[model samples]
Target: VPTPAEAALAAQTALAADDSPMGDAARWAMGLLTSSGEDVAARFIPTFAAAGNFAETVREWRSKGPFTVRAYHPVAHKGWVVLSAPAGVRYILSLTLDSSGLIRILTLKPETVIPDMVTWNDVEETLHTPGVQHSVYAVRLTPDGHEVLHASAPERPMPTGSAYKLYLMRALVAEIEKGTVGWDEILTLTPELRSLPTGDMQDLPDGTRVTVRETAHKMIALSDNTGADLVADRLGREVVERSLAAAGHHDPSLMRPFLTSHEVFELGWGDPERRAEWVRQDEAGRRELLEKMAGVMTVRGSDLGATVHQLGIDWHMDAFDVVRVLEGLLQDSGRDTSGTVEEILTAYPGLLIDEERWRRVYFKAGSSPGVMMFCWLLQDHAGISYVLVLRQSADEQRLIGDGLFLRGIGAKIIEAEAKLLSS
Candidate 1:
């Protein structure tokens, strides 16, 4: 009887001799069979053995066979074979002996290797295409895996904008998980929550009561500044800071709010001058005084700003990490009005790749003045995972163009890879 290890070696030898025109396909089949080991062989032998009357079956198959004899690889030591069928398809078949010295087909096709059709270099070249300015984009393909495709900037300190809400959500969820906060706990929106006008909660009245769950949804989906501030206040800025630090983001002053209007005014004005003690001030003091003088003259306009300022956010994160959190957010399978991340995934079906044959894609997008970024995680159905990040900074038009270029590159890589694997 051939030992398991010897059976594996025989299978390997048989696969190596496969000489089909589909070089990539043959090699991939051989690689899979050899690497997969006894588990594959055990599964394969029974199926082939059940096809009783082997000689008769083989004769019938050969005489009127649709399974064309495209190529063959013969194992020298143990009776093993690798064969190619019609249409460039390949299969690895191994023959081993039982204790009775009876020949048996030991293994079938085990591993599948697609060619190196896609690479980060291809992604970069596509991003650099003319008319595409730099920008930041994040994508997630699987629940816990992804890559940062193009991050020219270091993962250092930078303004996080509303992306800080992610940390707040994480902290809030942690508290809820630990029984620190009930799900139905209600919090009132305060005037301090007012900041950005571009969000959904901007016009809501102060003292408006909302649940923690509602606040989280608004903050994340609508990027509501007021909702975020309320949550931050409830969760405590310091707690959120600590949570982010524990998560390995160590930027100091993570929760410092943006400059207030009075601060802006002070910066605009320099030193105050003694103007009317019968002493005229110098140009510097006069400039300071004039700035302060002009402050009241200038219209206050709306106190609300376009920028969303929720402290303790990290706009730059690996795409895979974003997917991991989203996966957690999707844990609630109950059909409740409170939107789960799964519902959002359903709403954007196009964003989810086919997981049976193609892996699902997950991602997050962030934009700030002069910056756009994209990050992604891709999980192939074969259980392989890839992470990609792409970031660029330029004028608005060029930033959008960069996004298109990135998509083009991704599509091309997927196509090439599919062909290589299928060949």
Candidate 2:
């Protein structure tokens, strides 16, 4: 019989073999993972396996197979498998094995290598294609003087989907600091507070109690819509508006009376007439419409078809606005007595990169029909920090491509900037 460590090596080797494509290997490995029969779920830890995430992760990767194994660096029962991608982008797949030789941890990080010939200007030119509205911003944050890596249409107002949750998070932390709310305060999941899919909380039984910290975690880490609604409802509209100003949003009025996730979907996916009416209404009229639409929200599975709906009916922010809010969040986290702000922001750790290179990373991503956004706050071990945000909207066509591909470009830009700033 193979020792546990030997068994783990075999598992890692099977995954890293160049002889077999990742698709075939993934299917075979999945079978071996469940070879233990009915108790197979025990192999994964609670957080990773929560809410069908394990199955979803595998299923998503299943179709994106044919991954070429560039190299593998092993450490005991663990290893890092480097896979190359388009434009010199490489992904690091980290794997670890438990004492029983079962899969204990699995994560994929995109570490970008910028070619010497590539320039941010070249990247900005790519966004100028027909029927697409986009913005790209990159900067290195420092106490003395911030370095601007690239700023292309950074001030253009664009729809930010769920990225607006950062404002909600900022508001909640401020209230916590002011003795208005506590991190441990329990908020029950009522029927009125529930949003639609893209979250686990909506399926939970109404009246399920959860603390503010857990709700914020699900909001940022998972982009949970219901979690967002819960926090928004708790803080109220005025409070978040105040946070919007405090975070230095260029045009705070654009997001006034911020619509909850349910309301936004209801208007976008429910009825055409309602959305049209809301679009033409003034501020007061829209507020009244919201009140009238209350208790009638519905977004069916069929309505979520693959196409751009009304893109205007979303939170609007520029790349600079995102930068300001992120910087404020970092400052707030530093002063937060409870230390909750930092913990929640870094909960997801964004894309998996080399752990040794960065001190801590903060991430939040958002997407809708014709909208896709990626925001990353990286603090490297050298005490250098960088903020990179990419927001794209389809004006007359579908988005250019998948988010993963765009994210690789983002990784490349940041890595290139980090190296340049180091000198």
Candidate 3:
């Protein structure tokens, strides 16, 4: 297995190329990021040539002395926050590397850490909204991030939508750590592994293949349905249950009949006839059906109008218990623990409200007809980290006001963390 620094070097090599070759490019594999990480390559090409040539660039400092590899820390998004200097540069060059061994991102004025500027008053302001039927909540933590300032219903069960995919992701990572799989391991997409779209993977050719790492990235970073299903199927149906149990989650049985991403998109939410047949199936029968799983027929266009019916079915999750799943991975102190989950969640930070306002945050959200859920683990350079879970049952229209409520309150959380520590 490669170290984070090793992976960082690999990413740089790929990017420094005249043109990056065919390799596992997570975000670029889909259409989200700059393809082949050319974006990063483009930005740095002006100053350097080879991968890790940044060290050479830094050597120009120190009155032109030798460069030293100072640090290698993993950051969110299958990348690393590397520290290096000629022992004389004005600031440390923080080279961020993606999983594929490409310098796909950057921060020249890198910080030594992450901020919260949302106030308690701000938190309350976003928590309350006008003309809405709401059961919103929060459980904030104080500065320095060790203890919980308030622990809300961490045990309450709720529909997590796609946020539940995070459990499967950790399970996938666990397998990778055990040598049961590799980051570059490819999972072939078959009908059983295919799913509806909140993503483009479904449009891929039937035999299209991708790495387990990319699959996990798609599942979390962008909430890709087909991508989520592919990873879960590759991880095995029992992987999530096992991972959850290891994390002190609610009884494993609560997740008994776990649905595939397609099932989440098709069965209970769309066609009535399909749902009727599915709802009547016994455990063994369900397994038998899934073995030959075909996508569900849609009556209306893909959109959530209500919860739990014939159109879509979701993975079971206890609202409060779900936090433990993330807590285990997020707080894992093991050096072997990859920050893949962190990177995956932060892959598309722009999805956040006023994205620039956040210094560091890990986010995963789930949504389909009649379901919406999100899990956020936020942090700042002040050594403050806060974990939060929000699930709302609504259609696109219903979420109109809820979206505002969440972002406004989210701003408060991040802003407040910065405020608390500074004061």
Candidate 4:
């Protein structure tokens, strides 16, 4: 049964009006949220419960006290619940109810609630503030081609952190389309190919075989560094470099002799003298050193003591380069690959953009200790696609604060784009 917006709001009111800490009203509200089952809440729409157990959920609500409904937005047969926590933190929990007013669907959006006044210009002003190196690129696609909507330092390459995995994904697609690789083809995960955190695949035992399709999905959706290395090993560095060139990656040499995630970790966290020596080398020299140091390069042994490392060692790319890669993926979607590339890109949307407005959404993001990035490719019902890439890097602790600000900026980008399309 379709839930009326008014009825949904009334149900939301009951849940929010209850300030009791584990009292009857609180229990009742929790019950409604988890009635679908603790294991599977909101059968049709996945809720926040999937992140934790019912007990943890209750415990967290208690610790983060004074939960109140900040705002309610009514839509077709459902409404958006704006939940406010301490320190003025807010969340957009998309909610739906049955005719009886029990929860039918609920999804906690990954994006924080943004004020209506927050615009794209406001975001650009914030990024221009001192103390960081930043780049932003946004565009819209039409039948003829694409149009640039916004660009800031779009050309200068900044350390891209895990965003470099985009190249790995692009390369994988090319191989699949070239008939050199099949989506169903299986690749073994050996100890040497495993990398550190940003993934759990490293923990999987040696001799684990995973298909190319699954590897690409995990690499983009989960930002799995180990999955990246596994695919890199399968595709080979030359194939990946050529893919980068084909995608119009500005400086392919910067990524020449593509270093796997494991190698990045080893070089960044290994002996400082070894790192310094590698940094001073020419392209040929660095390649020789990489091969020479392969025996000693071990992720498990390296000590990641500092919050931020020297900048030059990480992967580097500019905002426009990201645009090209994403555009390449979109263009390649029409190719007769074994599996759909769009599915891999859209698996985890990275941000919660309204699906009602966009026919399809794709996203990828990456971060290191002091680097952050968020990229999205959105296609409207009219078949027009919009692209946005926001990135920031700093040498100080402000990188943490900047990340939150960037999220708000990313949200505004989508809002502004939607408005433009509507007009």
Highest lDDT model number: 2
Backbone clashes, each candidate: 32, 1, 32, 0
User: What lDDT does candidate 3 reach at residue 58?
Assistant: 29
Give the worst 10-residue stretch by lDDT in candidate 1.
Answer: 304-313
lDDT tens digits, residue span 1-423, model 2? 677566556655766453423323333444443343224365443334343565676565444443545645444334556555556566666554432344445666664333331676766764555777778787889887568877878878888888898888888888988999888999999878888645667767888999999999888876789999999888887788877888769988788768788888887788878877887898888888888888734776457544433435788888988988888888888897676788888876545455787787788777776778889888888767888888887754244444544555665665565453344
Candidate 3 lDDT over 6-74, as tens digits, reads: 865765554334133222232232112212214535443232335465444323333332333333332
Model 1 stretches astray by more than 4 angstroms: 1-119, 129-160, 250-362, 377-387, 394-423
TM-scores for the candidates: 0.44, 0.74, 0.60, 0.73
lDDT of 4 by residue, 201-281 (tens): 665778999998888777887677888988988998778888888875888877776778777788777777778878788
Q: Which whole-number lDDT from 0 to 100 does residue 49 have in model 1?
A: 36
Q: Write the per-residue lDDT of candidate 1 for residues 309-392, one digit (tens) a residue.
A: 112112444333444444443343222345443333232221324457654444433444334454344456665544444455
Ranking by lDDT: 2, 4, 3, 1
The TM-score that candidate 3 achieves is 0.60
**What clash pairs does model 4 have?**
none
Candidate 2 backbone overlaps, count: 1
In candidate 4 the C-alpha lDDT for residue 168 amounts to 87
Error of 4 at 325 (Å): 0.9
